[PDB]
């Protein structure tokens, strides 16, 4: 290290150094304490390679609660072999690592490798936190909302009622009848200290995996349902239902039924009822 080049502290001027000057002049008992600054300081990858090597010498096993906050543009470099032996327990550190992981505008559609080493960090955290917190899911669905319907039936059921609130119906697009049956009650048990219009607003997202016994009970609240929220419904919850029941649900949203006649929960329920019964709907429907 030359006379006048000994790093007095972290500054702009360090960028006009080289790879070999950094290892001889920079202190390791400094780089830890003051780290937040280096995120604003544009170093070359070659200079960051040396900085990554300088902290390897100080913290060899993992990296404390302290270090991972200002990790920034190194999360990308870090490979699963060392990530395994990490610790977090802070909602803050999370967002930072996920913001920079959102530095992939290469393939806006799944490029045949959507999630590599982030996969690990997540499973690494959920074990650390214990369960899946209300707070926790909010910040996850903010980077990956579709991850909810990209779990296995198991991990879905280890999920308490007070962590359904953080769901809006944007998450439950690519969900099949199996995964919705798991989530359904958890909602009905979460939103049980409630009633009326305040009740329905939230419940609408899941109603695809619900039973006849609670289609009856909905009608007697004079509630309104759309047509898009009828194509969801399970085949076998629909067929016990009378004319007046359907008309006390879809009600105003019914007119455009004619168009969606040859589709899932309709094409059969039409035939099931009487000809006369359908003609009182005055929507031009056949079979009886």
């Amino acid at each position, epitope marked *: 290290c*030359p006379s*006048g*080049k000994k790093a007095r502290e972290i*500054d*702009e*001027s360090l*960028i*006009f*150094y*080289k*790879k070999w000057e950094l290892e001889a002049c920079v202190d390791a008992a400094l780089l830890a304490t003051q780290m937040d600054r280096v*995120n*604003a*300081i*544009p*170093f*070359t*990858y*070659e*200079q960051l390679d040396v900085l990554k090597h300088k902290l390897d010498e100080l913290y060899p096993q993992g990296y404390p609660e302290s270090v991972i906050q200002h990790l*920034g*543009y190194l999360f990308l470099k870090m490979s699963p072999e060392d990530i395994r032996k990490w610790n977090v327990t802070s909602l803050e550190t999370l967002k930072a690592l996920l913001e920079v992981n959102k*530095g992939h*505008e290469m393939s806006p559609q799944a490029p045949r490798r959507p999630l590599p080493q982030v996969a690990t960090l997540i499973d690494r955290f959920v074990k650390g936190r214990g369960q899946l917190d209300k707070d926790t899911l909010d910040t996850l669905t903010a980077f990956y909302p579709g991850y909810l319907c990209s779990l296995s039936p198991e991990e879905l059921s280890s999920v308490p009622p007070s962590s359904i609130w953080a769901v809006r119906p944007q998450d439950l697009d690519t969900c099949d009848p199996r995964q919705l049956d798991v989530l359904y009650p958890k909602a009905r048990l979460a939103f049980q200290n409630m009633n009326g219009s305040e009740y329905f607003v939230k419940i609408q997202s899941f109603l695809g995996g619900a039973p006849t016994e609670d289609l009856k009970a909905l009608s007697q609240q004079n509630v309104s349902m759309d047509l898009a929220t009828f194509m969801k419904l399970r085949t076998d919850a629909v067929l016990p239902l009378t004319v007046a029941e359907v008309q006390k649900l879809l009600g105003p949203h019914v007119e455009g039924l004619k168009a969606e006649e040859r589709h899932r929960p309709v094409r059969d329920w039409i035939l099931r009822q009487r000809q006369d019964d359908l003609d009182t709907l005055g929507l031009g429907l056949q079979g009886g």
Partner: single-chain antibody
Amino acid sequence: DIELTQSPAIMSASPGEKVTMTCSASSSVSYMHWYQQKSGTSPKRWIYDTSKLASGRFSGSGSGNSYSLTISSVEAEDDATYYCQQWSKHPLTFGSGTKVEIKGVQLQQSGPELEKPGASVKISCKASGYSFTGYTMNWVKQSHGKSLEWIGLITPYNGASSYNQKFRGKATLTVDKSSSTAYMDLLSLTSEDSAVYFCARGGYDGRGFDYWGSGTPVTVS
């Protein structure tokens, strides 16, 4: 701050003569880089790291203050303005320029821009042929009559940008990684700033600006 005095102002070296041009420094210096510009077009990497030649009659030598470039056998193809750039303290400064009269990775910028004094403009600089988020992007000012002055730079990935404090507030360096096209935003223009502006890529382990761009002059009236 460190400012460099070149000599001579206008050299007149003959074909078949040994000549030495000097670049004496105010304070003691670490390393040095020499460049070469043909009037109108972009400069090119000639010498770097004191003596280490880039990719065979030229050379470089010195210690502390005294530092000099030397030509062995002068020809009729070595007639250009020669400059000296320092690499020690923030910020980066070039020499005034050594003129030699004989005794007898593509970085495409936007078109030349004309505006009114008291308004703003954005000029662009697109890259392709290398991984864009590992190297930098550097902006320099070639004025009429004066020399090269380094404005600032930016590491695209991180949005991280440093400036020569001379230009903090006149200069705004912006980037979009998807198209790999870096922008400078010059705010409130004067009859002084009517000059040329070059975007350049920094080399491996900060070994000078080995590639320079086209050139977007600016005109203010």
